[PDB]
CSV table of C-alpha atoms in Angstrom, one decimal:
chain,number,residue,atom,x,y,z
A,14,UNK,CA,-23.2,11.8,0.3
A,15,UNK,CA,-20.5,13.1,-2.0
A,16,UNK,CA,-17.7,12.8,-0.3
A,17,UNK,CA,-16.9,10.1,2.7
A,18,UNK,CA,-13.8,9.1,4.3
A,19,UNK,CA,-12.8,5.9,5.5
A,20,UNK,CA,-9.7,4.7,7.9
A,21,UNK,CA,-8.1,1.4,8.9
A,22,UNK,CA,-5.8,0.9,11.2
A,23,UNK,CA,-2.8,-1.8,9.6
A,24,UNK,CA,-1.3,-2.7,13.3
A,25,UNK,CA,-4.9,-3.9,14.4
A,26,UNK,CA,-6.7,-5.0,11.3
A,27,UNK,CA,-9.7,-2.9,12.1
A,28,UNK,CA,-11.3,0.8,11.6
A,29,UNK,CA,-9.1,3.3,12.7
A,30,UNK,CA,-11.8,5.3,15.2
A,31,UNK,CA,-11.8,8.6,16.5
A,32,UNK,CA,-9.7,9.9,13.5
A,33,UNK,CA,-10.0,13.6,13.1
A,34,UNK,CA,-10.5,14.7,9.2
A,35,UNK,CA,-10.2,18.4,8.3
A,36,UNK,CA,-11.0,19.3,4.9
A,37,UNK,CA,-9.9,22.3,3.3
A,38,UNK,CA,-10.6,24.1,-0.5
A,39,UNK,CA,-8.7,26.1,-2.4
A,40,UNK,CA,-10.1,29.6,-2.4
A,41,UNK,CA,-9.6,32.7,-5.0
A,42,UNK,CA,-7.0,34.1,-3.7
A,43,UNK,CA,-5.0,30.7,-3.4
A,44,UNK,CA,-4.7,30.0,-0.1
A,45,UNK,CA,-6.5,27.1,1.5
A,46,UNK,CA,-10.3,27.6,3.4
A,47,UNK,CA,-11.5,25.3,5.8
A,48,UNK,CA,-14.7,23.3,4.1
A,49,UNK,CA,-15.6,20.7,6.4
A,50,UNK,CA,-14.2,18.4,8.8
A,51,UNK,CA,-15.4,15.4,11.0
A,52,UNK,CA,-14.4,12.3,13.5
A,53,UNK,CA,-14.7,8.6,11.6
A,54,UNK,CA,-16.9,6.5,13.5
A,55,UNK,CA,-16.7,3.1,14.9
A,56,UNK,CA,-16.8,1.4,11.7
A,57,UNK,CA,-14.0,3.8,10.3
A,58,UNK,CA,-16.3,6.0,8.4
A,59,UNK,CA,-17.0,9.7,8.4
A,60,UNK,CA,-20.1,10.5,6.6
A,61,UNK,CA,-22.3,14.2,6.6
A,62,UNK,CA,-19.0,15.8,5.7
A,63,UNK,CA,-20.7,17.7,2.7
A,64,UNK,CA,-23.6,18.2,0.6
A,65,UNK,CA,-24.0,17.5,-3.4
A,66,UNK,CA,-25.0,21.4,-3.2
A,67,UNK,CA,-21.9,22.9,-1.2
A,68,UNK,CA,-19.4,20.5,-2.8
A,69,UNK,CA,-18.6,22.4,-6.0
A,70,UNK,CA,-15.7,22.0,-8.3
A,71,UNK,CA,-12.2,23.0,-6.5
A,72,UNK,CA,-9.6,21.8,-5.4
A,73,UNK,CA,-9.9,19.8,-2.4
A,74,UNK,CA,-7.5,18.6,0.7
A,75,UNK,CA,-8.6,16.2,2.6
A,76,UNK,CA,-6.6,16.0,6.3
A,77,UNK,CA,-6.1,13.1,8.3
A,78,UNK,CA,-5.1,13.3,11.6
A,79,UNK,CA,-2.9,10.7,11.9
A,80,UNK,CA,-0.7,11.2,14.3
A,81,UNK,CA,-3.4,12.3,16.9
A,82,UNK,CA,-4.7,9.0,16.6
A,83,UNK,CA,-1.5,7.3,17.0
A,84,UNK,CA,-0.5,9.1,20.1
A,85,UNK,CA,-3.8,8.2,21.6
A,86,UNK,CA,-2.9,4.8,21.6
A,87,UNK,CA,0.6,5.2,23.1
A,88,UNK,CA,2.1,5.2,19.6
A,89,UNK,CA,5.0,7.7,18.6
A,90,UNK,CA,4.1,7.8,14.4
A,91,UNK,CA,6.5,9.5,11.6
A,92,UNK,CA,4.0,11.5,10.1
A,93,UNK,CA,1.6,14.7,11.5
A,94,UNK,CA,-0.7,13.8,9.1
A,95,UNK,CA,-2.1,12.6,5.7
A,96,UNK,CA,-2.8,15.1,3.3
A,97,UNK,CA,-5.3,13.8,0.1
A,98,UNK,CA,-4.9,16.8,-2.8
A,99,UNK,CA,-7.3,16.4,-5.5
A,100,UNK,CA,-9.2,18.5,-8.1
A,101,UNK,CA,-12.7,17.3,-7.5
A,102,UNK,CA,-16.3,17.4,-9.9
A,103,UNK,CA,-14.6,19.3,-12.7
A,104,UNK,CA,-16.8,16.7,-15.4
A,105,UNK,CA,-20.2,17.0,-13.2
A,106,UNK,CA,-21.3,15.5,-9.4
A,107,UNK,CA,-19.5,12.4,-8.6
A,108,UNK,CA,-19.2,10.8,-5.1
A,109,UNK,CA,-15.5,10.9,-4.0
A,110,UNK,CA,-14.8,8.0,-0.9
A,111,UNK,CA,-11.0,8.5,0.5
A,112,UNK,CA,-9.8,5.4,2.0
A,113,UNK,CA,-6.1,5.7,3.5
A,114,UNK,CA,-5.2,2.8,5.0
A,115,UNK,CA,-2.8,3.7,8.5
A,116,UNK,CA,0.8,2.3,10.1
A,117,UNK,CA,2.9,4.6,12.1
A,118,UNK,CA,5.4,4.8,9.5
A,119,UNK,CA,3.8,4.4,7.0
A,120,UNK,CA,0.1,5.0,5.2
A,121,UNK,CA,-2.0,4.5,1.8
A,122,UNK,CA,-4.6,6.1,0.5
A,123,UNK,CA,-6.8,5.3,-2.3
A,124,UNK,CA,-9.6,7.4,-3.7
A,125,UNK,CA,-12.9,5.9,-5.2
A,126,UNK,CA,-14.6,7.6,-7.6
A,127,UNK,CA,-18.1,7.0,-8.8
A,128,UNK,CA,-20.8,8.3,-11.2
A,129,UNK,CA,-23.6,9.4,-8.6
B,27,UNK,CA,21.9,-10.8,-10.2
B,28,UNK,CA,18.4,-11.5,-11.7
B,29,UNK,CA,16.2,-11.5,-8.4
B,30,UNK,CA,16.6,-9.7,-5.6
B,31,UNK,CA,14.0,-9.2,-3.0
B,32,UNK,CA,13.6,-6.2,-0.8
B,33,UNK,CA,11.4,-6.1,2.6
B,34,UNK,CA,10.4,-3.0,4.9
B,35,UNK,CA,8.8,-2.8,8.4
B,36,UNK,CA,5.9,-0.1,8.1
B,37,UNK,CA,5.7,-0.1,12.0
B,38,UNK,CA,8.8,0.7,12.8
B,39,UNK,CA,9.9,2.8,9.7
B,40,UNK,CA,13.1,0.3,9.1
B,41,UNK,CA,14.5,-2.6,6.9
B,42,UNK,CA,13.0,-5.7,7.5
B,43,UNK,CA,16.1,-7.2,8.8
B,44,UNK,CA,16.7,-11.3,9.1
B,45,UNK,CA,13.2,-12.3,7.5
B,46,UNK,CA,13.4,-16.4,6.1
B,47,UNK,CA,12.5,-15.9,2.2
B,48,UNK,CA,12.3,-19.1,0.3
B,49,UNK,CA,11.7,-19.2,-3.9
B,50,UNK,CA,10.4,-21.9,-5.5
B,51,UNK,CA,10.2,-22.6,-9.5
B,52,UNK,CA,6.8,-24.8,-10.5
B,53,UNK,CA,7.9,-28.2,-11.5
B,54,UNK,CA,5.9,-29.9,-14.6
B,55,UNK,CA,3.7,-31.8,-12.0
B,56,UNK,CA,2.7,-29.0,-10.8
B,57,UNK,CA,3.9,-29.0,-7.4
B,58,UNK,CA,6.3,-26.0,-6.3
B,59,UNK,CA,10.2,-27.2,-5.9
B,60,UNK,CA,12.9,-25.4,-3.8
B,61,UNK,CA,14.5,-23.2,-6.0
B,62,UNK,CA,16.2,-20.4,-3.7
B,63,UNK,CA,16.2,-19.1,-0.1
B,64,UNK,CA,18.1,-16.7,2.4
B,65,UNK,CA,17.7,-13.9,4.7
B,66,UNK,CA,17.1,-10.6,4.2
B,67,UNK,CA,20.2,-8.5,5.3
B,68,UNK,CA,20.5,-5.6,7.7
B,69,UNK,CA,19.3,-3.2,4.9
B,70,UNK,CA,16.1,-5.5,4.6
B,71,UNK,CA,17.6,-6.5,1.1
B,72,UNK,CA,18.4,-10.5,0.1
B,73,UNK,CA,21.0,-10.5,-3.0
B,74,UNK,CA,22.4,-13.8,-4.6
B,75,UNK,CA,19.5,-15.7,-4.6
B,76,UNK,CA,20.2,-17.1,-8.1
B,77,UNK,CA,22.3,-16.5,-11.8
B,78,UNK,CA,21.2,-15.8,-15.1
B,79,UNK,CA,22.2,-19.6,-15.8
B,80,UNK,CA,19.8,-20.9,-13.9
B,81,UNK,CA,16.9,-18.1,-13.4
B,82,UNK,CA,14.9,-19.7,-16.4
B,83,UNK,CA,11.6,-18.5,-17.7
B,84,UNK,CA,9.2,-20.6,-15.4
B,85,UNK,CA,6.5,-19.7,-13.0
B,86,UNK,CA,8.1,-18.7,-9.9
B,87,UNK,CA,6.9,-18.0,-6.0
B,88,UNK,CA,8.6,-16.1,-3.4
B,89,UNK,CA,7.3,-16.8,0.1
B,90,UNK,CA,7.8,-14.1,2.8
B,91,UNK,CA,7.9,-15.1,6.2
B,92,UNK,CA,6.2,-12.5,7.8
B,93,UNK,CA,4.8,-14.5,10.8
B,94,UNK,CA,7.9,-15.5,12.1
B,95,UNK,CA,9.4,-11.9,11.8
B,96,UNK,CA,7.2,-10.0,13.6
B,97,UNK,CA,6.9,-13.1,16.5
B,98,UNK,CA,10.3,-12.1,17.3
B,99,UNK,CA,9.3,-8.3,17.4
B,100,UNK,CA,6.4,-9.3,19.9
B,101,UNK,CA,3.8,-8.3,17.8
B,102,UNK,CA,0.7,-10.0,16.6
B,103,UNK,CA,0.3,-10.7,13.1
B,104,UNK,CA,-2.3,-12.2,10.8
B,105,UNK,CA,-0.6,-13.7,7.7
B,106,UNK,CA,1.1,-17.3,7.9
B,107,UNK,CA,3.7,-15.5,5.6
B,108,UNK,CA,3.4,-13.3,2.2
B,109,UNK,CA,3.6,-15.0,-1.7
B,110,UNK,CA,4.2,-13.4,-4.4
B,111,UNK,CA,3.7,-15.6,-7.6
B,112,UNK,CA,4.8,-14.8,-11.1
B,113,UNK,CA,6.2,-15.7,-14.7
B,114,UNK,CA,9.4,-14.9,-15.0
B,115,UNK,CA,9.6,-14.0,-19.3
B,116,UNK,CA,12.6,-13.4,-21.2
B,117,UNK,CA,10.7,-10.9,-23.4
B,118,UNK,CA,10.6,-8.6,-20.8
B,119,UNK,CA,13.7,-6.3,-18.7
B,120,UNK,CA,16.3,-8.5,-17.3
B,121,UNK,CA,16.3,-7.8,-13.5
B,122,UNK,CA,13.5,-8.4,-10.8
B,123,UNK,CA,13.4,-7.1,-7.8
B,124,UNK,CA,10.3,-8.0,-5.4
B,125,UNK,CA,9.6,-5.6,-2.8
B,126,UNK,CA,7.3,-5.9,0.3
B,127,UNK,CA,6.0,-3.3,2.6
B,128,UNK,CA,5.1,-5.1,5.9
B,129,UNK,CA,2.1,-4.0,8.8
B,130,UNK,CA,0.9,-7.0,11.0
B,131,UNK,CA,-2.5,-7.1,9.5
B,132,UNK,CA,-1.2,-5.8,5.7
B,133,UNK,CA,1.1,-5.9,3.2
B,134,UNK,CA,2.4,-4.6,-0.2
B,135,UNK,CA,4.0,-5.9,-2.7
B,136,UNK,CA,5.6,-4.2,-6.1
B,137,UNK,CA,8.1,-6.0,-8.7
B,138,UNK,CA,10.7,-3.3,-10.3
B,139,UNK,CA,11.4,-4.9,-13.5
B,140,UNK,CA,14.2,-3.2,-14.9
B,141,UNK,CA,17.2,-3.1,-17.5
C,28,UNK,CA,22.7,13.0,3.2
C,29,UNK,CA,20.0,13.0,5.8
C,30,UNK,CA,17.2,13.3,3.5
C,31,UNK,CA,16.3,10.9,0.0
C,32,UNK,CA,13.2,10.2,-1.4
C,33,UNK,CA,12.5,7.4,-3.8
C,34,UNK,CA,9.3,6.9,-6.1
C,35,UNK,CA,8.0,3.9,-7.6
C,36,UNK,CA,5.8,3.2,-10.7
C,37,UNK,CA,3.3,0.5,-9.7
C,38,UNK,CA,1.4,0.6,-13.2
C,39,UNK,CA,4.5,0.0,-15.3
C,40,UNK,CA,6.9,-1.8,-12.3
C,41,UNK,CA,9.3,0.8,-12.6
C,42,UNK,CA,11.3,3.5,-10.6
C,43,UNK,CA,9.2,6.9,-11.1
C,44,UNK,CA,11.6,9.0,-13.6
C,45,UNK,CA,11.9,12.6,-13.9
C,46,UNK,CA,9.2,13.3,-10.8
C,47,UNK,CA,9.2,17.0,-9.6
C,48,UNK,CA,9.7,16.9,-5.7
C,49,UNK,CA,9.5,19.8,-3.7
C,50,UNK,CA,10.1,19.9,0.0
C,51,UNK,CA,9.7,23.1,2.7
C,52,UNK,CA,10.0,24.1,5.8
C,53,UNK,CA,7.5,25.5,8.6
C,54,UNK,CA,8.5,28.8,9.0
C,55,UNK,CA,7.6,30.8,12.8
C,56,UNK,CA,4.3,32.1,10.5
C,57,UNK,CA,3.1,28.8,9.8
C,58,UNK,CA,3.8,29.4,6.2
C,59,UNK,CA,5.7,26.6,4.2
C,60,UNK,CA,9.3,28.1,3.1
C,61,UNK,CA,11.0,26.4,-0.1
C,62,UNK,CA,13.4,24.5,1.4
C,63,UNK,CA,14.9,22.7,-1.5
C,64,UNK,CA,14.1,20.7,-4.7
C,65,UNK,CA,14.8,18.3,-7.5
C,66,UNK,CA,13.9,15.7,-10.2
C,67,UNK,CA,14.1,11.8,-9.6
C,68,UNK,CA,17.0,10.6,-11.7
C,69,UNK,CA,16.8,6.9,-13.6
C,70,UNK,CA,16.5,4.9,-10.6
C,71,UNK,CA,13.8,6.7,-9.2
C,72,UNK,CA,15.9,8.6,-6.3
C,73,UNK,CA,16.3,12.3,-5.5
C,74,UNK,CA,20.1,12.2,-3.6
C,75,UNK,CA,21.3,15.6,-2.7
C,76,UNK,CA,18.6,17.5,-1.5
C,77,UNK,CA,20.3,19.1,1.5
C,78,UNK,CA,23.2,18.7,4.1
C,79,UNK,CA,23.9,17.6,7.9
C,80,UNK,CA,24.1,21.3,8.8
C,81,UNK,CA,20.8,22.5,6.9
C,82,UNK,CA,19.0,20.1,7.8
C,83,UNK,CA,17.4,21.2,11.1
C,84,UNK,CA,14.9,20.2,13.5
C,85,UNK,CA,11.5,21.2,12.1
C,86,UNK,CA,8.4,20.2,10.4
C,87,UNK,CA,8.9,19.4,7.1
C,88,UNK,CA,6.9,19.1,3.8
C,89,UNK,CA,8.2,16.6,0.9
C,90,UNK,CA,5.6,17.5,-2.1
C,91,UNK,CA,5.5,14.6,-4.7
C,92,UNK,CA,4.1,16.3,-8.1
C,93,UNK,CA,2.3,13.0,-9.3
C,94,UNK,CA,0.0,14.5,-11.8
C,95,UNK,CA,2.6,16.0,-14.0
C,96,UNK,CA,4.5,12.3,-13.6
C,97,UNK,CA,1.1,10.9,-15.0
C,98,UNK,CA,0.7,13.1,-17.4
C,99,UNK,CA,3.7,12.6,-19.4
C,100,UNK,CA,2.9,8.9,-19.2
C,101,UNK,CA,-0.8,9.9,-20.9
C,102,UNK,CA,-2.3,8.3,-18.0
C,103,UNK,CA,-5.5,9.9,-16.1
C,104,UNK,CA,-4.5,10.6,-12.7
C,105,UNK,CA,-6.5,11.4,-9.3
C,106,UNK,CA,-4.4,13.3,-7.1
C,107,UNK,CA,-2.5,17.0,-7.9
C,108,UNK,CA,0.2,15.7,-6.1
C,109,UNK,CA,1.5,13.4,-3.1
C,110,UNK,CA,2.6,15.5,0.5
C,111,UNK,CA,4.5,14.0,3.6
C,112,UNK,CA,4.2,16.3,6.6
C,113,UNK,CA,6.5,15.2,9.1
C,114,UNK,CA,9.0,16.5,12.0
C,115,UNK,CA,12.4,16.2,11.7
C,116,UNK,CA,13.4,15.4,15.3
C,117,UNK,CA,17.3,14.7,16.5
C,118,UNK,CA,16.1,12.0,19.0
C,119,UNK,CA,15.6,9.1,15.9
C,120,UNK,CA,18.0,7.6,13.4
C,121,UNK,CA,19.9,10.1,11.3
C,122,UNK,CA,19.4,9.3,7.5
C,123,UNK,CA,15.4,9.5,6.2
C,124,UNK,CA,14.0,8.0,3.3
C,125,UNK,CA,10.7,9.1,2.1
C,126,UNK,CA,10.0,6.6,-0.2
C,127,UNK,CA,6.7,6.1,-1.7
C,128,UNK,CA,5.2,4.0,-4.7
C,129,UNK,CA,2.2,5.7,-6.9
C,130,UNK,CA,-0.6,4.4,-8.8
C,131,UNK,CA,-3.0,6.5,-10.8
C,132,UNK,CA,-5.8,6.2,-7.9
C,133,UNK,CA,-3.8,5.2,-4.8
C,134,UNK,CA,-0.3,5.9,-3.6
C,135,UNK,CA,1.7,5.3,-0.6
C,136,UNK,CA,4.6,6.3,1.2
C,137,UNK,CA,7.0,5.3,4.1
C,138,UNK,CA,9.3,6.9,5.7
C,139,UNK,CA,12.8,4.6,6.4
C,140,UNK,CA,14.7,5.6,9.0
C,141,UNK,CA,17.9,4.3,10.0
C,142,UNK,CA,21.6,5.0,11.4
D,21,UNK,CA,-20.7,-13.4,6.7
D,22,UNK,CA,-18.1,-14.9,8.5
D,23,UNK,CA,-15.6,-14.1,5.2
D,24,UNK,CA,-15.8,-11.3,3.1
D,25,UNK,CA,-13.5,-10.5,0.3
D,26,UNK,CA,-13.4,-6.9,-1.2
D,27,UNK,CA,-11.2,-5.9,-4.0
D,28,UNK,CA,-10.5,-2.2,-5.4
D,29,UNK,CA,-8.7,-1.3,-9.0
D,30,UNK,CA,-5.9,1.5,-8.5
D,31,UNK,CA,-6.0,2.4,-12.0
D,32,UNK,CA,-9.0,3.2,-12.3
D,33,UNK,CA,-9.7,4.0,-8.9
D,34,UNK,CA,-12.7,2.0,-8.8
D,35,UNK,CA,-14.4,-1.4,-7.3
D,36,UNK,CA,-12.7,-4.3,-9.3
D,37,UNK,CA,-15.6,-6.6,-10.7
D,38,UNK,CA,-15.8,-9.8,-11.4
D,39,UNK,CA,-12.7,-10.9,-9.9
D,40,UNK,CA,-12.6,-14.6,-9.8
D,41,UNK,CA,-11.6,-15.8,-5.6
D,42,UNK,CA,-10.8,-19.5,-4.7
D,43,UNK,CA,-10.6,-20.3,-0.8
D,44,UNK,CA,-8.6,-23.2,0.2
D,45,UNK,CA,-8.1,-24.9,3.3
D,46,UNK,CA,-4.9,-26.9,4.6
D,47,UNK,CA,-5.7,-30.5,5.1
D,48,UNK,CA,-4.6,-32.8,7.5
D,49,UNK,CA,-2.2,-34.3,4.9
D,50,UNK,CA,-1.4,-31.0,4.4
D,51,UNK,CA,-2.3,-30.2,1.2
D,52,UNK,CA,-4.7,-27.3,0.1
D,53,UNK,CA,-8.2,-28.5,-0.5
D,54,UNK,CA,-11.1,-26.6,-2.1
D,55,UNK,CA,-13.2,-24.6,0.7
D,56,UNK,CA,-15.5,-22.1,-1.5
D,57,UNK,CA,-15.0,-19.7,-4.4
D,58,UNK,CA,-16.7,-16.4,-6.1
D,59,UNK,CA,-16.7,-13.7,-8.6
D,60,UNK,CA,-16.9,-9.9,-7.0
D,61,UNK,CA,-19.6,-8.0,-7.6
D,62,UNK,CA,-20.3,-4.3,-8.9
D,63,UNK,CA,-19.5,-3.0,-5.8
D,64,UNK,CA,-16.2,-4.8,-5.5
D,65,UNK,CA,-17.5,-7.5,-3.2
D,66,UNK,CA,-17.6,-11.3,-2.8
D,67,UNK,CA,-20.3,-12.2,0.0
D,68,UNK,CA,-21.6,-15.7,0.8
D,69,UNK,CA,-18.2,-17.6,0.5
D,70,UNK,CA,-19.3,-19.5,3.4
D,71,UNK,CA,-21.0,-20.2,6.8
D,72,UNK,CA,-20.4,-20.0,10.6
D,73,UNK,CA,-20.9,-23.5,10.4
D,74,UNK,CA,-18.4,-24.5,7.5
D,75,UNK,CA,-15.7,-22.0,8.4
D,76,UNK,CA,-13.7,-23.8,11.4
D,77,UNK,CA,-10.5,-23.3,12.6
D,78,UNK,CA,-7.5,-23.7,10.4
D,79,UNK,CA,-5.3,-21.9,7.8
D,80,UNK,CA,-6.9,-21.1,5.0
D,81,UNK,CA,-5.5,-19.1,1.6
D,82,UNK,CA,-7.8,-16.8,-0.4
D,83,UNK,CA,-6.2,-17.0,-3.8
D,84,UNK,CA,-7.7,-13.7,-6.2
D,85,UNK,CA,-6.9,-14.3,-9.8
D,86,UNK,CA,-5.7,-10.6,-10.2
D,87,UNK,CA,-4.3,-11.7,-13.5
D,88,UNK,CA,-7.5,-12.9,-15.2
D,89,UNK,CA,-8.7,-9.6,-13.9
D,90,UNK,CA,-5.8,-7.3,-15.8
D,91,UNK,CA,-5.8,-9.4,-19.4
D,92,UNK,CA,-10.0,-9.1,-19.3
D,93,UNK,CA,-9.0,-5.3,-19.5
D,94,UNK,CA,-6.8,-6.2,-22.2
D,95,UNK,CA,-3.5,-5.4,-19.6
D,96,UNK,CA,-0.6,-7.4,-19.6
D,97,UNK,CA,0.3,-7.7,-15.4
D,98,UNK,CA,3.7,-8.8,-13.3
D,99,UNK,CA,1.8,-11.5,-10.7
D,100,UNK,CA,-0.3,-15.0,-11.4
D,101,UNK,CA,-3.0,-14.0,-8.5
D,102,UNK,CA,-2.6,-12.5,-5.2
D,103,UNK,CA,-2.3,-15.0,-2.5
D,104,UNK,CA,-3.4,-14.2,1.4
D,105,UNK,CA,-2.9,-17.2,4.1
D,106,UNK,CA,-3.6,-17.1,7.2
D,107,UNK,CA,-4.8,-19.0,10.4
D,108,UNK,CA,-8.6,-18.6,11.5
D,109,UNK,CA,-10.7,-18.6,14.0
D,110,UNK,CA,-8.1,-20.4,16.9
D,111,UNK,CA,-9.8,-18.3,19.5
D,112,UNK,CA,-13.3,-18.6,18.4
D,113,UNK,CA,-15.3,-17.2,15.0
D,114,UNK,CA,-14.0,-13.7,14.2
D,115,UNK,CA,-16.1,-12.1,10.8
D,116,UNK,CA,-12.9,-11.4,8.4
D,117,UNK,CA,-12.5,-8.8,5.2
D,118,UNK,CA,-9.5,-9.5,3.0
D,119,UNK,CA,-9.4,-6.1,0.6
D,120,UNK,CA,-7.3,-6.3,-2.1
D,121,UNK,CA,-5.7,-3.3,-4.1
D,122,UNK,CA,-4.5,-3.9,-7.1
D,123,UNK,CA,-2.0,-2.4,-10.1
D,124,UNK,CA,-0.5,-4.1,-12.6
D,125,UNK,CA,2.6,-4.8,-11.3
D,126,UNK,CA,1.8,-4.3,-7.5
D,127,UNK,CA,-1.2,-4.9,-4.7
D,128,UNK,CA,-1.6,-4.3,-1.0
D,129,UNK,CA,-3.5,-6.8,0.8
D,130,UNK,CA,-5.4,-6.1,4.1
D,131,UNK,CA,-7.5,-8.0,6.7
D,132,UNK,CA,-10.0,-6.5,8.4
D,133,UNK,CA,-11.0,-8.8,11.8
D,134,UNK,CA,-14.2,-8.5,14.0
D,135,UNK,CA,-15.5,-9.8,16.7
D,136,UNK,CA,-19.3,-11.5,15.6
């Protein structure tokens, strides 16, 4: 499990569920090619995205569907999304976990990076 | 102006208007004294709190009351209030200015320490 | 000025100086259109990036270039760069802030929006 | 695991370990008297604090001694510790994550509350 995704909601104090995640690499020609994409679960987390085989070096954006989520709940929120842009396993494999961390105006996002 | 403190509302995407912020200064007993307090104005910013004279080096703490703030929103929060403890140090730049970032169940805090 | 955007330095408690922000707007095609552009001056703010009159309804884009900002500080970054994707909508308060604080691993932003 | 603390460097993007974590819990005089304390682990983690038993109702402050944490790493930081207080379990036991994020001169706090 290279790269997971995990989401909490800031108004609540709990796991932001049901969050859709799109993720997109940056292709030859420069433009940006769907790569995975998932729902987090009831703890938060979206796992399965990719595998260590698929996920090669790139560039990498990872979408968060934040306002989806908010409007779900009742909750007009300033932003469409949250957009994570990062060049990933350009020194070898590591596991990538994206945390953001979600309020309507407002979000975080943190990335842990380990040696797999 | 030495300190200044600075508070936002993340849910609402606005100043943090009319939150209680009290400062104290640890005393040689250890026990924290009153040192400063006020509320934060309609631009979620609290100026005047205290004057070079008297802003010694010291350890200081700067309580937020988040609690009651977003009570009178109607919201449920989980902190009693936010604290933000630090040395001041002359070595250092010469203005401080605490800022906090406020969700119900989370907050932020940054000092910009500055010339 | 409807539209500002201030960084903050979390690592050294300073405004972010001299950051590259970009911003663009969602053309009919779905492509992002340069919309304007600037560097964040000693305080850490970006004033003048477009007018009243410019600035429309529409989705905007307000790129961040963190990883050059690192860079310069010889500091190992994560991301290639911070991006808030929001709509611009009449309805709301008139002035936006985009303000957002940046550490090498983790940012955040928030968006302040008031009369 | 009624109590969980969980703390994350944003420098390095990584778990912080070995973070020392003192609970306290108000007293009836109304002072703040010892409850528990822990170090983090590899993973970031403090587990075991305490016990459904032990952790009753009443406000409680998880003090995290982010500045031992920064000068270990030979980094000079802004704050003394990172303070979190807060009133528990008045409507029954609820299992609670405090995560910390740290930087030198900054950290987001969040609580993360469950229902056993």
């Amino acid at each position: 499990c290279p790269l997971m995704v995990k989401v909490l909601d800031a108004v609540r104090g709990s796991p932001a569920i049901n969050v859709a995640v799109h993720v997109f690499r940056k292709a030859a020609d420069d433009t940006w090619e769907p790569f995975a994409s998932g729902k987090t679960s009831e703890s938060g987390k979206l796992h399965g995205l990719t595998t260590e085989e698929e996920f090669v070096e790139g560039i990498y954006k990872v979408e968060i569907d934040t306002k989806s989520y908010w409007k779900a709940l009742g909750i007009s929120p300033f932003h469409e999304h949250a957009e994570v842009v990062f060049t990933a396993n350009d020194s070898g494999p590591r596991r990538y976990t994206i945390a953001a961390l979600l309020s309507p105006y407002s979000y975080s996002t943190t990335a842990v990076v380990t040696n797999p």
